Structures are given as C-alpha cells and as structure tokens.
Design an enzyme around this catalytic site. Structure first.
Site, mmCIF file in Angstrom:
data_model
loop_
_atom_site.group_PDB
_atom_site.id
_atom_site.type_symbol
_atom_site.label_atom_id
_atom_site.label_comp_id
_atom_site.label_asym_id
_atom_site.label_seq_id
_atom_site.Cartn_x
_atom_site.Cartn_y
_atom_site.Cartn_z
ATOM 1 N N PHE A 206 0.851 -1.182 0.000
ATOM 2 C CA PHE A 206 0.000 0.000 0.000
ATOM 3 C C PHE A 206 0.884 1.228 0.000
ATOM 4 O O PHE A 206 1.766 1.369 0.843
ATOM 5 C CB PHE A 206 -0.939 0.014 1.215
ATOM 6 C CG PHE A 206 -2.218 -0.738 0.989
ATOM 7 C CD1 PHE A 206 -3.406 -0.059 0.780
ATOM 8 C CD2 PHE A 206 -2.222 -2.120 0.927
ATOM 9 C CE1 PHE A 206 -4.589 -0.743 0.545
ATOM 10 C CE2 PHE A 206 -3.409 -2.819 0.688
ATOM 11 C CZ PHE A 206 -4.593 -2.115 0.494
ATOM 12 N N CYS B 49 -5.620 15.121 0.215
ATOM 13 C CA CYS B 49 -6.861 14.805 -0.486
ATOM 14 C C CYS B 49 -7.526 16.082 -0.957
ATOM 15 O O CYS B 49 -7.327 17.126 -0.351
ATOM 16 C CB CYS B 49 -7.824 14.034 0.415
ATOM 17 S SG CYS B 49 -9.383 13.606 -0.408
ATOM 18 N N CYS C 42 -16.081 15.515 1.637
ATOM 19 C CA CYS C 42 -16.092 14.137 2.156
ATOM 20 C C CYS C 42 -15.885 14.161 3.661
ATOM 21 O O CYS C 42 -14.825 14.571 4.148
ATOM 22 C CB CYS C 42 -15.004 13.271 1.495
ATOM 23 S SG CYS C 42 -14.945 11.533 2.077
ATOM 24 N N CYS D 107 -14.328 10.117 6.292
ATOM 25 C CA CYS D 107 -13.026 9.442 6.137
ATOM 26 C C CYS D 107 -12.524 8.737 7.407
ATOM 27 O O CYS D 107 -12.576 9.309 8.489
ATOM 28 C CB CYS D 107 -11.981 10.454 5.697
ATOM 29 S SG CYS D 107 -10.451 9.716 5.101
ATOM 30 N N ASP D 108 -12.019 7.507 7.255
ATOM 31 C CA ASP D 108 -11.490 6.736 8.380
ATOM 32 C C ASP D 108 -9.965 6.749 8.437
ATOM 33 O O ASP D 108 -9.360 6.007 9.220
ATOM 34 C CB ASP D 108 -11.994 5.279 8.309
ATOM 35 C CG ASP D 108 -11.461 4.518 7.093
ATOM 36 O OD1 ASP D 108 -10.789 5.126 6.232
ATOM 37 O OD2 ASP D 108 -11.713 3.281 6.999
ATOM 38 N N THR D 109 -9.348 7.597 7.620
ATOM 39 C CA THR D 109 -7.908 7.499 7.351
ATOM 40 C C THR D 109 -7.119 8.750 7.733
ATOM 41 O O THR D 109 -7.616 9.873 7.619
ATOM 42 C CB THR D 109 -7.682 7.175 5.839
ATOM 43 O OG1 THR D 109 -8.309 5.920 5.538
ATOM 44 C CG2 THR D 109 -6.203 7.084 5.489
ATOM 45 N N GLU E 30 -7.143 3.275 -5.516
ATOM 46 C CA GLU E 30 -8.345 3.586 -4.753
ATOM 47 C C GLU E 30 -8.601 5.076 -4.927
ATOM 48 O O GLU E 30 -7.812 5.872 -4.444
ATOM 49 C CB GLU E 30 -8.152 3.271 -3.266
ATOM 50 C CG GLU E 30 -7.768 1.832 -2.965
ATOM 51 C CD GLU E 30 -8.990 0.959 -2.751
ATOM 52 O OE1 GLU E 30 -8.890 -0.282 -2.946
ATOM 53 O OE2 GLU E 30 -10.048 1.521 -2.379
ATOM 54 N N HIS F 226 -9.748 -6.035 6.929
ATOM 55 C CA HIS F 226 -8.566 -5.779 7.749
ATOM 56 C C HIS F 226 -8.941 -5.328 9.173
ATOM 57 O O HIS F 226 -8.175 -5.514 10.114
ATOM 58 C CB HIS F 226 -7.652 -4.736 7.091
ATOM 59 C CG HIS F 226 -8.334 -3.450 6.733
ATOM 60 N ND1 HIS F 226 -9.253 -3.349 5.707
ATOM 61 C CD2 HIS F 226 -8.184 -2.199 7.229
ATOM 62 C CE1 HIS F 226 -9.650 -2.093 5.596
ATOM 63 N NE2 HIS F 226 -9.021 -1.374 6.513
HETATM 64 C C1 SAM Z 1 -9.349 6.436 2.506
HETATM 65 S S1 SAM Z 1 -10.023 6.357 0.879
HETATM 66 C C2 SAM Z 1 -8.588 6.810 -0.063
HETATM 67 C C3 SAM Z 1 -8.815 6.781 -1.604
HETATM 68 C C4 SAM Z 1 -9.773 7.911 -2.070
HETATM 69 N N1 SAM Z 1 -9.675 9.108 -1.194
HETATM 70 C C5 SAM Z 1 -11.220 7.325 -1.999
HETATM 71 O O1 SAM Z 1 -11.980 7.942 -1.220
HETATM 72 O O2 SAM Z 1 -11.533 6.323 -2.687
HETATM 73 C C6 SAM Z 1 -9.950 4.534 0.681
HETATM 74 C C7 SAM Z 1 -11.311 3.785 0.751
HETATM 75 O O3 SAM Z 1 -11.850 3.777 2.094
HETATM 76 C C8 SAM Z 1 -13.214 4.145 2.030
HETATM 77 N N2 SAM Z 1 -13.610 4.701 3.314
HETATM 78 C C9 SAM Z 1 -13.231 5.913 3.833
HETATM 79 N N3 SAM Z 1 -13.757 6.181 5.003
HETATM 80 C C10 SAM Z 1 -14.544 5.071 5.274
HETATM 81 C C11 SAM Z 1 -15.393 4.751 6.353
HETATM 82 N N4 SAM Z 1 -15.606 5.564 7.401
HETATM 83 N N5 SAM Z 1 -16.044 3.566 6.308
HETATM 84 C C12 SAM Z 1 -15.854 2.764 5.255
HETATM 85 N N6 SAM Z 1 -15.084 2.963 4.180
HETATM 86 C C13 SAM Z 1 -14.457 4.147 4.246
HETATM 87 C C14 SAM Z 1 -13.285 5.138 0.872
HETATM 88 O O4 SAM Z 1 -14.610 5.307 0.369
HETATM 89 C C15 SAM Z 1 -12.390 4.422 -0.138
HETATM 90 O O5 SAM Z 1 -13.129 3.414 -0.824
HETATM 91 N N1 2K8 Z 2 -5.389 -3.891 4.700
HETATM 92 C C1 2K8 Z 2 -5.892 -2.712 4.327
HETATM 93 N N2 2K8 Z 2 -6.601 -2.621 3.209
HETATM 94 C C2 2K8 Z 2 -7.010 -1.373 2.882
HETATM 95 C C3 2K8 Z 2 -6.733 -0.243 3.654
HETATM 96 C C4 2K8 Z 2 -5.999 -0.340 4.853
HETATM 97 O O1 2K8 Z 2 -5.710 0.573 5.624
HETATM 98 N N3 2K8 Z 2 -5.606 -1.639 5.118
HETATM 99 N N4 2K8 Z 2 -7.136 1.037 3.285
HETATM 100 C C5 2K8 Z 2 -7.932 1.219 2.079
HETATM 101 C C6 2K8 Z 2 -7.386 2.498 1.428
HETATM 102 O O2 2K8 Z 2 -7.145 3.452 2.198
HETATM 103 O O3 2K8 Z 2 -7.221 2.502 0.186
HETATM 104 C C7 2K8 Z 2 -7.949 0.027 1.095
HETATM 105 N N5 2K8 Z 2 -7.739 -1.289 1.690
HETATM 106 S S1 SF4 Z 3 -12.352 8.823 1.915
HETATM 107 FE FE1 SF4 Z 3 -10.703 10.129 2.868
HETATM 108 S S2 SF4 Z 3 -9.105 10.136 1.309
HETATM 109 FE FE2 SF4 Z 3 -11.012 9.415 0.160
HETATM 110 S S3 SF4 Z 3 -12.032 11.354 -0.582
HETATM 111 FE FE3 SF4 Z 3 -12.855 11.028 1.500
HETATM 112 S S4 SF4 Z 3 -11.509 12.301 2.817
HETATM 113 FE FE4 SF4 Z 3 -10.415 11.983 0.889
HETATM 114 NA NA NA Z 4 -7.793 3.218 5.075
#
Ligand code: SAM
Ligand code: 2K8
Ligand code: SF4
Ligand code: NA
Ligand code: SAM
Ligand code: 2K8
Ligand code: SF4
Ligand code: NA
Ligand code: NA
Lengths: 209, 209
Positions: free
Chosen positions: B24, B30, B45, B48-50, B115, B203
């Site tokens: 990864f 973003c 958006c 986001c969990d990231t 992604e 995961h």
């Molecule tokens: C962190 S985003 C990064 C790539 C790009 N920003 C996107 O949104 O596709 C990676 C994946 O995690 C999903 N994701 C983000 N926050 C989430 C949440 N709270 N629950 C489930 N999926 C989530 C997004 O929709 C995307 O499919």
């Molecule tokens: N194992 C694992 N798989 C993933 C994620 C992540 O954080 N861990 N994050 C997602 C992402 O941020 O793209 C996609 N799939």
């Molecule tokens: S899921 Fe996170 S990284 Fe993807 S568009 Fe939303 S804020 Fe940006």
């Molecule tokens: Na993630």
C-alpha cells in the site's frame, strides 16, 4: 432424485465470490465423512463445520426431479432481479449434481458455482468451480476457477497445490478452537508466498447464514 | 516529487481483491478534505477513516522521483516472489500519481491498483481501477474495474450507480459509531438488488494493517 439438506438465500461468505448474493443448495451426504459425530475422529475429513445429514433444514427435502429443485431455488431469488447465482454445496455436491440439474439451472437463468472437495470428477459445464482439497483424500480435480485450501491440515503439501491449473489460489483458516491462530498462520502464508490470497469465512464475522 | 504518508505490506482488506497481498502506497493529501478534524464538518467528504496528513508514517516521506519511490515499494516485497501488486491510495492518489510512476512500477513488475474518490481523471494504464464516489462530490470517472460505494450517504442515488461502466458494483458499510447498523443495511441492499455485492473492511475484522 435429489436429497437436499437446506436451500437458502444469503451472501457467499467465502472464496473469490465472497459478498455475492447467492442461493445455496446444500445437498445431503458426503463421501469423506458420514456426518455423525461418532465417526468424526476416524473420518477422512475430520474438521467439517457443517450439518449435512438428512433433508430437514430450511426448504430441505427429497426432490423428485431437477425441475422441482430448480423451482424451489428460483423461488428464493428476488422477483424481477437478474444476476441469478446458485452455489451447489453440501455435503459433497458431486455425489448428486448431474447434467440435467445443471441444464435446468442454466435454463432458469442461473450461473452455477460448486463447492467440492475435489475427490470426485466435476461437470465442466459448471460456471464456477471451487475445489477445497482434503489432505487425506485423493485429489482428482486438478483444474478449476479457485483452489481454496483449508489450513492447517496434517500431511499437507501446500506449496505443491500452487502448481495446479486454477485461476485463484486461496488459503482459508480452519475454524474451531484455534481459528484466530490459524488466521494468523494463513495471513503469514500469503504474505510470504503472494501467489496465495486469504479466504475468510466472512459469514461468521457478519453473523449471517 | 511525491509526498507519501506511509508505505506498508499487507493484504488488501477491501473490494474484489480483498485477501490479496499488496504493498500500500498511501499518498498524503486529499482534495475533498484537509484531513484536519476542525474541517471535517464542513468538508465535501466527511466520513473518512484514514490519516493522510503529512509524511511521517511507516516508510513515509518526500520522494525525489519515481525511481526512489518504486525502490521503497519493491523493497517491501518478499525476495524472489512474483505477483507484485501495489495499491495506490491516500489521501487522493490522483493528486500525485503520474505516468512516470506508473511506468516505473510496471517496469519493476508490479500490477497497479488505485483507490480513488472518482472526482479526478484517472490514468487508464492503471491495471485495477477502484472508484468510491462521494455523494456531494462530482463523479468524473464513470468506468473502471470496481465501483465500491460506501453506504449510507445522504444525497445518494445508489441504484443509478449501476448504470455506469464497471465490472463489479459493491457496497461498503460506513465505519464509525453505526458500523453494525450500516453492515445490516448493506447486506439487505445486496440481497434486494443482487447486481451489488458486499465489500467488508476485512482488515478491521482481522486486525491487520
Ligand atoms: C481512505 S479512501 C482513499 C482513496 C480515495 N480518497 C477514496 O476515497 O476512494 C480509501 C477507501 O476507504 C473508504 N472509506 C473511507 N472512510 C470510510 C469509512 N468511514 N467507512 C468505510 N469505508 C471508508 C473510501 O470510500 C475508499 O473506498
Ligand atoms: N489492509 C488494508 N486494506 C485497505 C486499507 C488499509 O488501511 N488496510 N485502506 C484502504 C485504502 O485506504 O485505500 C484500502 N484497503
Ligand atoms: S475517503 Fe478520505 S481520502 Fe477518500 S475522498 Fe474522502 S476524505 Fe479523501
Ligand atoms: Na484506510
Ligand atoms: C462444508 S464444505 C462442502 C463442500 C465440499 N464437501 C468441500 O469440502 O469443499 C464447504 C467449504 O467449507 C470448508 N470448511 C469445512 N469445515 C471448515 C472449517 N472447520 N473451517 C474452515 N473451512 C471449513 C470446506 O473445506 C469447503 O471449502
Ligand atoms: N454465507 C455462507 N457462505 C458459505 C457457507 C455458509 O454456510 N454460508 N457455507 C460454505 C459451504 O458450505 O459451501 C460456502 N460459503
Ligand atoms: S468433504 Fe466437505 S462436506 Fe465432507 S466432511 Fe469435509 S468439509 Fe464437510
Ligand atoms: Na458451511
Ligand atoms: Na442515502
């Protein structure tokens, strides 16, 4: 005539098709275990997580022909929706799944998957062939769509399986008292040998049938 | 020059490739959220969990050129094993992922997945395109390999997404305080509309990176 334990509509929990809506047709009976707990300790396959004895589950019964069985399977599909998909399992489905049932399912618009232990010839008109080899049984099905190996089993030659003619090579952790341990083993195996991918039994995490 | 939050080796947790070993590469930054909690409530958006802020994660940093970044990515792959696969994510990877990086990854024998939130044009030489549309953002990428929709979102026209040009249509439950609730909604959606399949964040159940 078909002896069916249960027929139900859910999401496929395992393998490359995990997450996909499917009618499960679980045939009664297996060739590697009688299904009786008294026999488990001496069986060829000893780790089975499934009840495949008798025809007393949901929609289970003895079906007099393929048409009767297809009618029940079709009846579980949402009205007006396509993408019909049936997973033939058990038990060992190749004890009973035959060309007339395969043809009738196809004529009703179903794509057909099978879950088979690989110890018996499979019908190649089946659309998706998943083979899950048991370490102490013959493996006569050496080509298919996915090879989904439950690990660990004693006597297993795991790396050797990767030589066979499949599109996907998966390891699935053996559920039981050591599921979490086996899951770590499986994750590590794939990371070391990335031809392999992990198959979780997701329906057990989602708590769905 | 590339700003990378983290680079790590694990199994893809999500989508059609769930279970597959992958490096990864998480790009920093973003276009739909600053990544700051004080801005989340007003962001395009909001769920986001990231953490994609800065370049301070595992192997994260500012990379001189494509060759430097590919060197770090390739370095995480098990020695002497093929099936190289990298998931470009973030953050929004299309802010930074350019043709020279794609070409360099390909020359190093990597298959490339992305992604992406779908609001930016994608490089069509990318091998696996996963688009995850955000209901209050534009969607300019209307073809790809999988459309993985996080549900529920307000303003969503979920059924209509199925008219776009993708191989797979998935719903992924929104994680947060209502994950189990949203998981039940997502399962129900697929069973009602079986063109759709469920994407779990495996995961998080496996407790792996
Ligand atoms: C962190 S985003 C990064 C790539 C790009 N920003 C996107 O949104 O596709 C990676 C994946 O995690 C999903 N994701 C983000 N926050 C989430 C949440 N709270 N629950 C489930 N999926 C989530 C997004 O929709 C995307 O499919
Ligand atoms: N194992 C694992 N798989 C993933 C994620 C992540 O954080 N861990 N994050 C997602 C992402 O941020 O793209 C996609 N799939
Ligand atoms: S899921 Fe996170 S990284 Fe993807 S568009 Fe939303 S804020 Fe940006
Ligand atoms: Na993630
Ligand atoms: C119940 S078997 C029926 C199909 C066929 N008899 C077979 O063994 O493939 C369906 C799937 O569940 C797997 N399985 C059985 N017991 C298991 C267990 N304890 N843990 C994990 N998977 C298991 C089998 O290997 C197979 O892939
Ligand atoms: N949801 C769900 N998926 C499954 C199973 C099962 O019992 N439930 N059983 C497995 C089987 O017995 O074939 C295959 N995948
Ligand atoms: S071969 Fe399949 S159905 Fe038979 S006992 Fe083993 S896992 Fe169960
Ligand atoms: Na089962
Ligand atoms: Na909605």
């Amino acid at each position: 005539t078909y002896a069916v334990k249960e027929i139900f509509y859910t999401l496929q929990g395992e393998g490359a098709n995990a997450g996909r809506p499917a009618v499960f047709c679980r045939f009664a009976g297996c060739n590697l275990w009688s299904g009786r707990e008294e026999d488990r300790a001496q069986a060829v396959c000893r780790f089975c997580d499934t009840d495949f004895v008798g025809t007393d589950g949901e929609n289970g019964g003895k079906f007099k022909d393929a048409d009767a069985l297809v009618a029940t399977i079709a009846g579980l599909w949402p009205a007006g929706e396509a993408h019909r998909f049936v997973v033939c399992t058990g038990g060992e489905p190749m004890l009973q799944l035959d060309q007339p049932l395969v043809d009738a399912l196809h004529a009703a618009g179903f794509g057909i998957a099978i879950e088979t232990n690989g110890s018996l010839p499979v019908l190649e008109s089946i659309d998706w062939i998943c083979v899950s080899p048991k370490a102490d049984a013959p493996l006569v099905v050496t080509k298919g769509n996915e090879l989904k190996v439950v690990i660990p089993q004693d006597n297993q030659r795991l790396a050797d399986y990767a030589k066979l003619d499949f599109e996907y090579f998966l390891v699935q952790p053996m559920d039981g008292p050591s599921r979490d341990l086996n899951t770590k083993l499986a994750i590590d195996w794939c990371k070391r040998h990335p031809q392999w991918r992990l198959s979780m039994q997701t329906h057990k995490y989602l708590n769905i049938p």
